Predict the structure of Major prion protein.
Amino acid sequence: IIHFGS
Amino acid sequence: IIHFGS
Amino acid sequence: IIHFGS
Amino acid sequence: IIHFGS
Amino acid sequence: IIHFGS
Amino acid sequence: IIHFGS
Amino acid sequence: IIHFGS
Amino acid sequence: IIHFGS
Amino acid sequence: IIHFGS
Amino acid sequence: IIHFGS
Protein backbone atom coordinates (compact mmCIF):
# COMPACT_ATOMS: atom_id res chain seq x y z
CA ILE A 1 0.00 0.00 0.00
CA ILE A 2 0.98 3.52 -0.88
CA HIS A 3 -1.63 5.85 0.66
CA PHE A 4 -1.52 9.63 0.45
CA GLY A 5 -4.62 10.66 2.37
CA SER A 6 -6.80 9.34 5.17
CA ILE B 1 2.77 0.36 3.91
CA ILE B 2 3.75 3.88 3.03
CA HIS B 3 1.14 6.21 4.57
CA PHE B 4 1.25 9.99 4.36
CA GLY B 5 -1.85 11.02 6.28
CA SER B 6 -4.03 9.70 9.08
CA ILE C 1 5.55 0.72 7.81
CA ILE C 2 6.52 4.24 6.93
CA HIS C 3 3.91 6.57 8.47
CA PHE C 4 4.03 10.35 8.26
CA GLY C 5 0.92 11.38 10.18
CA SER C 6 -1.26 10.06 12.98
CA ILE D 1 8.32 1.08 11.72
CA ILE D 2 9.29 4.59 10.84
CA HIS D 3 6.69 6.93 12.38
CA PHE D 4 6.80 10.71 12.17
CA GLY D 5 3.70 11.74 14.09
CA SER D 6 1.51 10.42 16.89
CA ILE E 1 11.09 1.44 15.63
CA ILE E 2 12.07 4.95 14.75
CA HIS E 3 9.46 7.29 16.29
CA PHE E 4 9.57 11.07 16.08
CA GLY E 5 6.47 12.09 18.00
CA SER E 6 4.29 10.78 20.80
CA ILE F 1 8.70 11.17 -7.20
CA ILE F 2 7.85 7.67 -6.14
CA HIS F 3 10.37 5.32 -7.81
CA PHE F 4 10.46 1.57 -7.31
CA GLY F 5 13.39 0.52 -9.48
CA SER F 6 16.63 1.97 -10.79
CA ILE G 1 11.47 11.53 -3.30
CA ILE G 2 10.63 8.03 -2.24
CA HIS G 3 13.14 5.68 -3.90
CA PHE G 4 13.24 1.93 -3.41
CA GLY G 5 16.16 0.88 -5.57
CA SER G 6 19.41 2.33 -6.88
CA ILE H 1 14.25 11.89 0.61
CA ILE H 2 13.40 8.39 1.67
CA HIS H 3 15.92 6.04 0.00
CA PHE H 4 16.01 2.29 0.50
CA GLY H 5 18.93 1.24 -1.67
CA SER H 6 22.18 2.69 -2.97
CA ILE I 1 17.02 12.24 4.52
CA ILE I 2 16.17 8.74 5.58
CA HIS I 3 18.69 6.40 3.91
CA PHE I 4 18.78 2.65 4.41
CA GLY I 5 21.71 1.60 2.24
CA SER I 6 24.95 3.05 0.93
CA ILE J 1 19.79 12.60 8.42
CA ILE J 2 18.94 9.10 9.48
CA HIS J 3 21.46 6.76 7.82
CA PHE J 4 21.55 3.00 8.31
CA GLY J 5 24.48 1.95 6.15
CA SER J 6 27.73 3.41 4.84
